[PDB]
C-alpha cells in the first residue's frame, strides 16, 4: 500500500508550499533599524561550592532566592543564593540523575534519571525532615526532563520516545503524548501552563496541548539532536539548541523558522538555553567551557561568560531577571549579575 | 553583624557541609566497574558467580566493588554513556561459542571496537572475559573456525583457535599506549575470575595514584 504514502507526501508538500507562501521578509530586515545593544559585561557575584561530582540540572525558585541543584553524588542541594547558604541536602536512592524541578509553591521538588522513575520529595513536613512523597513509574526509558504544573500535576519527558502528564495524588499516567521517533531531551511549559513544547533527538520539536493531548505543530530545520528548549516570555515563540553548534528561534503563529544564531568559531554543541526577562538577550551554554549571550533580534554576540573549567550543563535565569545561574561539569555553581 | 537566626542558619549550613564531606570521603573509597556484553554473551554467570540500571555488589579482600549493568537500556548509547566517565574499569563479556551464525562474534567485535575507541573512555582499562569455553570446545570438535574467520594455514586445536580469537579481539585497540586491556578465559574454579578482576583493578589504582602526584 503506497497510496497513503503518496497522500502523506503530497500533504507535506502542501505544508511546505503554504509555509513558503507565508514568508515575505526576515526578522533581520525588520530589526536592522534597532540600535546595537552594545557589549554586555557580567561578573561572578556568588560561587556555590558544595557538590563533589558533575552537576546535571538546576532550577530557580519562584521567589528568585532559593534554587535546587542535582549532581551525580546522589545529592539534591537547596541553596539560598543571596547568602550562599545550604537549606536542605536530600540523599537520592539512585545516583544517576539527569533532571531537577522546583514546585511553583515551593512545597515539593522532583528528580529523575537513568532509573526510569520520577521521585517527588516533600519539603515542609511536621516531622522536620525531607521525605520522598511519591515515586512515579511507567516509563521504559531514562527521564530527561520534568516540570511542575502545580502542586498536584507534573509533566515528564523520557527516552522512550514518549511524554507523559501524571497525577501525583493517584500516581498514574493521566495522559500520554506519543508522536516522536527519537529520544526526547527537553521540555518547556508555556507561561499560561496550557501548552508546551518538546525537543527530540529526531532533530525536531513539537507543540503539545496539555488539556486533551495531541500534537498541534511540528517544527523542523535543525541537523542533529536537540538538547534544550525554552519558551519566549511572550509565549508565542521558542528557542532550540542542538548539537550542530547553532541555536534557532521558531514562532508558533508563523509556523516557520524565524532566525538562526551561529558563528564560524563555535563548532561544539549546545547544552542549555534560556531567555531574559524582557526577551532581548538569549543565553546559551556550550561545550566550549563558556556560555554566550546573543542579541535576540540582531543575532550578534554581545558577551561571553567564561568562568568554568568544564562543559556547562545547566543554565537558568531568575523570575525577576536579576541574576543568572550556571552549572558545569565541575562541581562549582556560579551566579552572574 | 548578623542576627541570631542568621547565625543559627550559618551553623546549620556548616553541619550540612560536614555531612556532605563525610559522605563524599566514605563514597570515594569504592571501586566502580561497568559491565558490558552482547545479550546472551554470558553476563549472567560472572554476576551470579559473586527497570533501568541494575547495580550488583560485593566485598573482596577488604575492597568494595560496585558493578553497574545497564541491561535493558534499549535507547541511544551516545546520549548517556558520558555519565559513566571515571569508572575504574569496563568488564566486557564475550562468548567463544557464538561463531556459528546469526554473525554473533562479529556483532561482539563491532561493539568492542565502538566501546574501546571512544572519546570518553580514552584511558579506562578494559577487562575482557571469554566465557562459554566448553561449548566452544564441543563445537570445534567437528566444525572449523573458518566459518567465522576465513583464514589459517595454522591448525584447528583449542589452544591455537583461542589464541587467534584473543589476538583478533586485542587487535581492535587503537590507543595502544594510553589504554591497556586484560584478557582472561573464565574458569569453573571459584576464586579465579574475582582474583583477576582484583589484579586489574589494583593495577589501574596504582597507575591513577602515580598520575596524581605526577611521578608518572
Amino acid at each position: 500500500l503506497d497510496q497513503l504514502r503518496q497522500e502523506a507526501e503530497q500533504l507535506k508538500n502542501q505544508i511546505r508550499d503554504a509555509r513558503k507562501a507565508c514568508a515575505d521578509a526576515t526578522l533581520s530586515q525588520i530589526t536592522n533599524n534597532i540600535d546595537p545593544v552594545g557589549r554586555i559585561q557580567m561578573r561572578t557575584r556568588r560561587t556555590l561550592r558544595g557538590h563533589l561530582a558533575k552537576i546535571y540540572a538546576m532550577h530557580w525558585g519562584t521567589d528568585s532566592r532559593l534554587l535546587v541543584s542535582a549532581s551525580q553524588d546522589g545529592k539534591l542541594i537547596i541553596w539560598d543564593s543571596y547568602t550562599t547558604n545550604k537549606v536542605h541536602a536530600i540523599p537520592l536512592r539512585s545516583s544517576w540523575v539527569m533532571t531537577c524541578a522546583y514546585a511553583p509553591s515551593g512545597n515539593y521538588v522532583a528528580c529523575g534519571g537513568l532509573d526510569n522513575i520520577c521521585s517527588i520529595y516533600n519539603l515542609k513536613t511536621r516531622e522536620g525532615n525531607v521525605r520522598v512523597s511519591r515515586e512515579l513509574a511507567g516509563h521504559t526509558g531514562y527521564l530527561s526532563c520534568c516540570r511542575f504544573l502545580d502542586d498536584n500535576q507534573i509533566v515528564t519527558s523520557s527516552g522512550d520516545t514518549t511524554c507523559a502528564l501524571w497525577d501525583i495524588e493517584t500516581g498514574q499516567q493521566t495522559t500520554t503524548f506519543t508522536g516522536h521517533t527519537g529520544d526526547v531531551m527537553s521540555l518547556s511549559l508555556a507561561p499560561d501552563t496550557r501548552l508546551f513544547v518538546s525537543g527530540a533527538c529526531d532533530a525536531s520539536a513539537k507543540l503539545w496541548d496539555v488539556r486533551e493531548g495531541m500534537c498541534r505543530q511540528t517544527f523542523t530545520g535543525h541537523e542533529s539532536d536537540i538538547n534544550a528548549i525554552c519558551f519566549f516570555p511572550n509565549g508565542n515563540a521558542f528557542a532550540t539548541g542542538s548539537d550542530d553548534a547553532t541555536c534557532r528561534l521558531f514562532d508558533l503563529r508563523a509556523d516557520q523558522e524565524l532566525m538562526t544564531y551561529s558563528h564560524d568559531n563555535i563548532i561544539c554543541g549546545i547544552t542549555s538555553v534560556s531567555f531574559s526577562k524582557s526577551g532581548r538577550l538569549l543565553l546559551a551554554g556550550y561545550d566550549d567551557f563558556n556560555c554566550n549571550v546573543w542579541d535576540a533580534l540582531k543575532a550578534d554576540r554581545a558577551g561571553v561568560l567564561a568562568g568554568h573549567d568544564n562543559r556547562v550543563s545547566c543554565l537558568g535565569v531568575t523570575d525577576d531577571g536579576m541574576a543568572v545561574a550556571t552549572g558545569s561539569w565541575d562541581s562549582f555553581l556560579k551566579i552572574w549579575n | 553583624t548578623l542576627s541570631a537566626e542568621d547565625k543559627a542558619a550559618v551553623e546549620r549550613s556548616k553541619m550540612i557541609d560536614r555531612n556532605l564531606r563525610e559522605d563524599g570521603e566514605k563514597a570515594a573509597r569504592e571501586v566502580k566497574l561497568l559491565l558490558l556484553g552482547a545479550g546472551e554473551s554470558g553476563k549472567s554467570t560472572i554476576v551470579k558467580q559473586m527497570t533501568g540500571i541494575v547495580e550488583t555488589h560485593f566485598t573482596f579482600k577488604d575492597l568494595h566493588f560496585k558493578m553497574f549493568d545497564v541491561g535493558a537500556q534499549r535507547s541511544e548509547r551516545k546520549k548517556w554513556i558520558h555519565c559513566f566517565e571515571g569508572v575504574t574499569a569496563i568488564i566486557f563479556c564475550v562468548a567463544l561459542s557464538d561463531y556459528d551464525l546469526v554473525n554473533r562474534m562479529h556483532e561482539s567485535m563491532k561493539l568492542f571496537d565502538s566501546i574501546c575507541n571512544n572519546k570518553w573512555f580514552t584511558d579506562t582499562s578494559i577487562i575482557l572475559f571469554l566465557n562459554k569455553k566448553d561449548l566452544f570446545e564441543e563445537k570445534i570438535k567437528k566444525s572449523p573456525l573458518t566459518i567465522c574467520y576465513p583464514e589459517y594455514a595454522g591448525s584447528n586445536t583449542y589452544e591455537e583457535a583461542a589464541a587467534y580469537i584473543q589476538c583478533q579481539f586485542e587487535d581492535l585497540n587503537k590507543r595502544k599506549d594510553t589504554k591497556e586491556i586484560y584478557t582472561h578465559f573464565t574458569c569453573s574454579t571459584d576464586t579465579k575470575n574475582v582474583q583477576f578482576v582484583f589484579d586489574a583493578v589494583t593495577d589501574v589504582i596504582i597507575k591513577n595514584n602515580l598520575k596524581d602526584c605526577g611521578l608518572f
Partner: single-chain antibody
Amino acid sequence: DVQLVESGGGLVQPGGSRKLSCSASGFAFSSFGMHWVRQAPEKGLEWVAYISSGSGTIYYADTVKGRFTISRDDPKNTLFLQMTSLRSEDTAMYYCVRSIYYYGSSPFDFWGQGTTLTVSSSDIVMTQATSSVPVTPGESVSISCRSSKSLLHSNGNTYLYWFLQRPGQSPQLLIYRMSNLASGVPDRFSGSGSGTAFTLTISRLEAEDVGVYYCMQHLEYPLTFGAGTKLEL
C-alpha cells in the same frame, strides 16, 4: 503525634539539685534547637536556657547563669536541664519548646506540656500596657505591644512573635516575625505594625479564643517576653 513530655518536678528544699528531663517523640530531634522556658505561678513567661543543634551553641539567662546547665542526648532523644543551689524564686512551671532555624522556618512552633517545681521558704524591655480587655463574641479585638529598640534588622526581618495561652493549657505559636501566620492558625488572626509598635488583630472573635497573649522578641539573646494581655468573657 509530635508529643513532647517533661518530668522532674515536685517540692525541693532550698539548696537542692533537682534535674528536669524532657523526652520528645515523633520528629527529628537531632536537627531541632531546643529551649527551656519557665513561667512563674502567677506572672508571665521568662526565657531560661537554649541549646542549638549539635550542641555547638549554648545560652543562659542572667538570673540563672552559673546555676543551671543544659544538655542533650540525641541517640535516645532526651533533653536535660540540671539545676543547682535552688532559691525561693525558682518555683515555676517549665516548658520544653523546640525551634529550627533556616530560611523560611518557624521557630517556637511546638510547646511542651509543663513540669511543676516548687521550693519551700542593656536588655530590650517590651511592654504591653493594658492587661484586661472586655470582649464579646462576634466582635473585633486589637492587642498592642511596644518595644524599646527597633526590631527592624538591616536585612529586612522584624523579629517579633505573638503567642496565645489558653486557660489550663500550654502556649502555642500564633504569629512569627510579626507578619507570618503559623501553621494550623485560622485566617482571622493577623499582625501588623512598624518598629517599636506592633498590633495583633482578631476579626470576628468567637469562643475558645480567650486567654493570655504574649509578645516576644528574637533580635538578640536574652529573649524577653511581655507582661501579657488577658481576654475575659
